[PDB]
Enzyme design. Structure first.
Site, short mmCIF file in Angstrom:
data_model
loop_
_atom_site.label_atom_id
_atom_site.label_comp_id
_atom_site.label_asym_id
_atom_site.label_seq_id
_atom_site.Cartn_x
_atom_site.Cartn_y
_atom_site.Cartn_z
N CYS A 4 0.84 -1.19 0.00
CA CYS A 4 0.00 0.00 0.00
C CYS A 4 0.89 1.25 0.00
CB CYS A 4 -0.94 -0.01 1.20
SG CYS A 4 -2.26 -1.25 1.04
N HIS B 261 -11.51 -14.39 6.67
CA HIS B 261 -10.61 -15.46 7.06
C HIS B 261 -11.34 -16.64 7.72
CE1 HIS B 261 -11.55 -13.59 10.85
NE2 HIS B 261 -11.04 -14.69 11.45
C1 KOU Z 1 -15.18 -9.90 9.31
C2 KOU Z 1 -14.70 -10.24 10.69
N1 KOU Z 1 -13.48 -9.84 11.04
C3 KOU Z 1 -13.02 -10.13 12.28
C4 KOU Z 1 -13.74 -10.83 13.21
C5 KOU Z 1 -13.13 -11.09 14.55
O1 KOU Z 1 -12.99 -12.52 14.80
P1 KOU Z 1 -11.56 -13.10 15.23
O2 KOU Z 1 -11.07 -12.24 16.38
O3 KOU Z 1 -10.63 -13.05 14.04
O4 KOU Z 1 -11.89 -14.51 15.67
C6 KOU Z 1 -15.03 -11.27 12.86
C7 KOU Z 1 -15.86 -12.03 13.81
N2 KOU Z 1 -17.04 -12.42 13.50
C8 KOU Z 1 -17.74 -13.40 14.35
C9 KOU Z 1 -18.19 -12.76 15.66
O5 KOU Z 1 -19.26 -11.86 15.43
C10 KOU Z 1 -18.90 -14.05 13.59
O6 KOU Z 1 -19.05 -13.72 12.41
O7 KOU Z 1 -19.60 -14.92 14.19
C11 KOU Z 1 -15.51 -10.96 11.58
O8 KOU Z 1 -16.75 -11.31 11.16
#
Ligand code: KOU
Ligand code: KOU
Ligand code: F9F
Ligand code: F9F
Ligand code: CL
Ligand code: CL
Ligand code: CS
Ligand code: CS
Ligand code: CS
Ligand code: CS
Ligand code: NA
Ligand code: NA
Lengths: 268, 396, 396, 268
Positions: free
Chosen positions: B61, B85
């Site tokens: 970037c 991810h």
């Molecule tokens: C697009 C995105 N980035 C980061 C995170 C953060 O999750 P970690 O810390 O990486 O495990 C999430 C989390 N989502 C969960 C909780 O609502 C869920 O969808 O059920 C996410 O959707």
């Protein structure tokens, strides 16, 4: 104290099982809860299991989920529950009082302090629903330092090592789980438990009380016939509270009728 | 008894009802076995490459760092199938379910990204999927709920407790406690009872492994720091894992600061909560003074898990990793900056990580530093939220 | 005078006002030069890999073909940065703009995907971007318009004519006719005046080049057919180009059949329109009996270009490629099928191609055939449309 | 016929440039359009340029975009335009009539047929806005087979080859574009064209008429002074129609005043 030991000895010489209701403290309010509990005792309860309202009761089905929610709606806090417990003991000298806790409420202001408060108010046992025997050491140690019986779960999926551990570490009673899943009257255990009951006796475990899905006299009698020291019933009791929120009079009448019938069934 | 230590120092453990201990033991043993099995690994690699699209790009970037001595790369988990991810580890957990003979999947979700990832992996691999989601989240995330349903998953609103993610977590465990002989619980972050923190890390570790290979190829050295947002901890531990023994490499986790730490309206338990025991683990929690579990607040829906993975709490305690917070406004600014200057719309969750990188750069613009931000998701999902905020401010 | 033939057989040409001829000549000469320039090619490759994320996966779809002798692979342009294949050629056209010393970009868009792609490439490469979009499309595509605006592009609603894509096409050319010394017209499909059909094909040809390499690696032979939807023709010609001389390989283009060809409410001019002269080219058009240009109709927003690239008209005439149509209902069924059976939500545009592949399979399920569908975009954008349709039908 | 040749010869012996208005046929309706056109002629127009309404007039600015839209709102079709053209010629024997077409309307029912219809109604020239000299062959061939002058654009960006091609192929007049961009009175050409005018004469091109952005008498005079045979004005005329849609009386008065002034300015 020796409240469970004394109860079980007395029941042995009445050729009776124990009938043990569960309710959530403060459901549907503090004053009504106190009356509920006195009604359970007057109707024949041999011991009590009492839940402190917790935000995340992950071993409980919807009936008891809703009981926790009603106690919260009434503003019931753990501190208020401990005040209620002190008053219950101040009224009733010999009935064993067991708490149903979740780990965070025990850990929150220190494990040792938790059990010290239990001793102060005159609680007899603590079952921590989300602490398995594998994690139990600080909880059971604090319990015993404060004259509190640590209540272990003997699941139907128990191997010999678990039977031996729960036999060795437990006091008061051994909780004999009817089935997998969570609390609730809508699901009845379908597993014979007499073999686990026999092995627990061989290993000099605390007397067994069957719990989960107990809602009927025949199940109380069955528990006694299989060799258990008695039976716990929660959701069936709580459903009567739920059903009668709009009539405290009918609620107490129906609780009395239910507990009396269930206790009668404990006659061998 | 377990094969592996269930704790990271003092954090973690297996705080579930006794009934679930056999399930956790079985999962641990199936994982340890799978990790030694070349067939399992080949199948996982095949799904990751040909279905999910790994490896992901590492994008330099240049516009956003012009005129400073920061070099910034984004690891592009936003380009993964599903757009976050979460897809990586659901593919591995689905294979573990099959390994154990399980035919059904239970999952919890807050923002719905993990639910969508569970649903897509289950559709692909022929598993029946049921997803619990707090009713308030169901109401606020109708697009994700519909995506899950299009993929054939059953989405079950949870009305108990606060009707949010912690309540969904409980419901998933309630179900599993009575269905573990046939169903696998596909937990969505690097938290919960052992062995989940371990499994989720290992099934996300390709993020940092690829990043290491890519940065060596492009820059001829390791990064000065890698930076990831921390909700429950999965994307961050996936980025961090391969660098843990590279002690020159900073590991920076970013929790949501919400309206500001001082307001109490945040989601930063690792640094500003209190250790408790919940959801199968001993870890820092959002919780009331008397030990009731509380919600996490953030502008970003996906940073709602009210605790944090135990490995993060451990890495913090020993000083291997550092944890910071970024407020809603900081995250929103980073979001707009990346859109305008790089043509990439980031998830508001990972916008927190980018915001901290921009701070590291702006605060010390003559410091020579090579940073990687994990861009754990794309932000198309967030443009309505951002539109509404910008309109309310009279920015549009 | 040009370097290259402006026609494909009888189709194509350079039907623009005289004032624009120098601009087209300059573009042709810059393209021919760039195609010989290793520096240009390296820069384009760098953007495609590290920014857009090429190469894209080639996914085998086993569930949807189970119990037949069809093997089906999807080329995953849905995983490209931006979520559609439009990103590939905008990166190349942006480099061509820079090559010519142009500092501004004009683009037209209908569904908004090309507008988003133009905006992101312009943000990355520091070009000032203005996008014309029929006012009716602006109203119906507020998410894409907002994405374009977040990326710093100016989006200009066009209220003339039918206030749709053809009107936006005209406005872009009106602007270019008075700004060509400083601005490049980044046309979004393989149509318009020479040299655009040629440039867009060459800057999309990596789709089929990768597909060829991938299918040889996985199956040890070329496909029996490759299948792509045809709006203006860019994703299809990008898939087809590398296979044109492999005459064993079928090339199947799928135009939108809308409510049915017989209703007249469709977007299939190559097979069911009439040759006209418009937007700089001689090609099959949607048009009234007296030669006024008409709109294309489809459930899918992105198959709205009311003509078709001249190379497709040519390949059809000589019988090298075959062109078919798929109705709204067929496309919707394919969309639901891929969601449920593969965990992939496809764009409704490419759902047309998938629908034709499913037809080839279902009609002759004992025929041994190796098919590739170009999945030119993801379908998250379409879930509202699909939700609304399914609700109206009482399916939900 | 030789209508442009005759006009230019006569204007040469009046020492005058040509003033040539553009309007869209059928704007704002067929009957009002016919009256508009007769007003232009009576006020001094030397020739006409007449647009057939097209869906996609991509060389036109907003003023003429809106004229096309108004004619469509009145249901005007190409066939109706050809009826109007026949009537205009039936009224006026010698005035040159040029059409402004887009390629699709010419190609639609066959190029040759298009020019044959032009000959039948008595059109003198056709300019196809989106056909450059490079593509012109079938259009210019059909034009000449049917006694129609093909009108070529000489852009300010013209090289020598283009000058030679337009000089050779064109008839009637050569269209000398004022500037880049599209039609419209809001943008005035800022490029001197005398050099292109001189080269066109050297190459024996059809006489030049300057067009685009002509809205004022001084620009008409300037075109003549630079050596052009005259000037075309479209948007300025159409704006008067637009301004006065709600008063056909005032519309005709203002058109007459404008055309008279612009024609007066063509005196050398
Ligand atoms: C697009 C995105 N980035 C980061 C995170 C953060 O999750 P970690 O810390 O990486 O495990 C999430 C989390 N989502 C969960 C909780 O609502 C869920 O969808 O059920 C996410 O959707
Ligand atoms: C997701 C998607 N798939 C296919 C096509 C079809 O375009 P080709 O035929 O491949 O050129 C489009 C087109 N979109 C244009 C027109 O609305 C636009 O966005 O401006 C699209 O958005
Ligand atoms: O009659 P039911 O079905 O409501 O069951 C009675 C439940 N009340 S309790 O306090 O014994 C009780 C006992 C154990 C529990 O969880 C654990 F096994 F995991 F530890 C939960 C509640
Ligand atoms: O006065 P303005 O600015 O409206 O210009 C007059 C326009 N009317 S016209 O028929 O001569 C005319 C002439 C040429 C046109 O396009 C082309 F150059 F590309 F061929 C369009 C219209
Ligand atoms: Cl420990
Ligand atoms: Cl030709
Ligand atoms: Cs004991
Ligand atoms: Cs820099
Ligand atoms: Cs098959
Ligand atoms: Cs001539
Ligand atoms: Na956190
Ligand atoms: Na088409």
């Amino acid at each position: 104290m020796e409240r469970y030991e004394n109860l079980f000895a007395q029941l042995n010489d009445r050729r009776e099982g124990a009938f043990v209701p569960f309710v959530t403290l403060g459901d549907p309010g503090i004053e009504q809860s106190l009356k509920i509990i006195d009604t359970l005792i007057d109707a024949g309860a041999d011991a009590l299991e009492l839940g402190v309202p917790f935000s995340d009761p992950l071993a409980d089905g919807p009936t008891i989920q809703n009981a926790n929610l009603r106690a919260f709606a009434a503003g019931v806090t753990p501190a208020q529950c401990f005040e209620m417990l002190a008053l219950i003991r101040e009224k009733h000298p010999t009935i064993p009082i067991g708490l149903l806790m979740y780990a965070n409420l025990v850990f929150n202001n220190g494990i040792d302090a938790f059990y010290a408060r239990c001793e102060q108010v005159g609680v007899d046992s603590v079952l921590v629903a989300d602490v398995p025997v594998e994690e139990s050491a600080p909880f059971r140690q604090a319990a015993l330092r404060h004259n509190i019986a640590p209540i272990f779960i003997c699941p139907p999926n128990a191997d010999d090592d678990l039977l031996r551990q729960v036999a060795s570490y437990g006091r008061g009673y051994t909780y004999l789980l009817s089935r997998s899943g969570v609390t609730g009257a809508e699901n009845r255990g379908a597993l014979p438990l007499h073999h686990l009951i026999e092995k627990l006796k061989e290993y000099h475990a605390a007397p067994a009380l069957q719990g989960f899905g107990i809602s009927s006299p025949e199940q109380v009698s069955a528990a006694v016939r299989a060799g258990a020291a008695g039976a716990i019933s929660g959701s069936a009791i709580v459903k009567i509270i739920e059903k009668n929120l709009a009539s405290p009079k009918q609620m107490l009448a129906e609780l009395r009728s239910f507990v009396s019938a269930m206790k009668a069934a404990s006659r061998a | 008894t377990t094969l592996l230590n269930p704790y990271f120092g003092e954090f973690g453990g297996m705080y579930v009802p006794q009934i679930l201990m056999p399930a956790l033991n079985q999962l641990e043993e199936a994982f340890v076995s799978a990790q030694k099995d070349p067939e399992f690994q080949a199948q996982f690699a095949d799904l990751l490459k040909n279905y999910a699209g790994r490896p992901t790009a590492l994008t330099k970037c240049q516009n956003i760092t012009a005129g400073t001595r920061t070099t910034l790369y984004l690891k592009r988990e936003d380009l993964l199938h599903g757009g976050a991810h979460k897809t990586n580890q659901v593919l591995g957990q689905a294979l573990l379910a099959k390994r154990m003979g399980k035919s059904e999947i239970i999952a919890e979700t807050g923002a719905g990204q993990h639910g969508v990832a569970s649903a897509l992996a289950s559709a692909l691999l022929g598993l029946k999927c049921r997803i619990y989601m707090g009713a308030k989240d169901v109401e606020r995330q109708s697009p994700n709920v519909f995506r899950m349903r299009l993929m054939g998953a059953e989405v079950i609103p949870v009305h108990s407790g606060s009707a949010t993610l912690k309540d969904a977590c409980n419901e998933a465990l309630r179900d599993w406690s009575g269905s573990y002989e046939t169903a696998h619980y596909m937990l969505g972050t690097a938290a919960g009872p052992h062995p989940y923190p371990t499994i989720v890390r290992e099934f996300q570790r390709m993020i940092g492994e690829e990043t290491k290979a890519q940065i060596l190829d492009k820059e001829g050295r390791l990064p000065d720091a890698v930076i990831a947002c921390v909700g429950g901890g999965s994307n961050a531990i996936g980025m961090f894992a391969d660098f843990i023994n590279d002690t020159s490499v900073g590991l920076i986790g970013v929790e949501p600061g919400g309206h500001g730490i001082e307001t109490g309206e945040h989601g930063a338990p690792l640094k500003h909560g209190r250790v408790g025991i919940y959801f199968g683990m001993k870890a820092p929690m959002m919780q009331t003074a008397d030990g009731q579990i509380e919600e996490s607040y953030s502008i970003s829906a996906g940073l709602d898990f009210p605790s944090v993975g135990p490995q993060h709490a451990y890495l913090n305690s020993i000083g291997r990793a550092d944890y910071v917070s970024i407020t809603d406004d900081e995250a929103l600014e980073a979001f707009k900056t990346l859109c305008r200057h790089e043509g990439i719309i980031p998830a508001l969750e990972s916008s927190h990580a980018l915001a901290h990188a921009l701070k590291m750069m702006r605060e010390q613009p003559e410091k020579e530093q090579l940073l990687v931000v994990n861009l754990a998701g794309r932000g198309d999902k967030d443009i309505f939220t951002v539109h509404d905020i910008l309109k309310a401010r009279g920015e549009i």
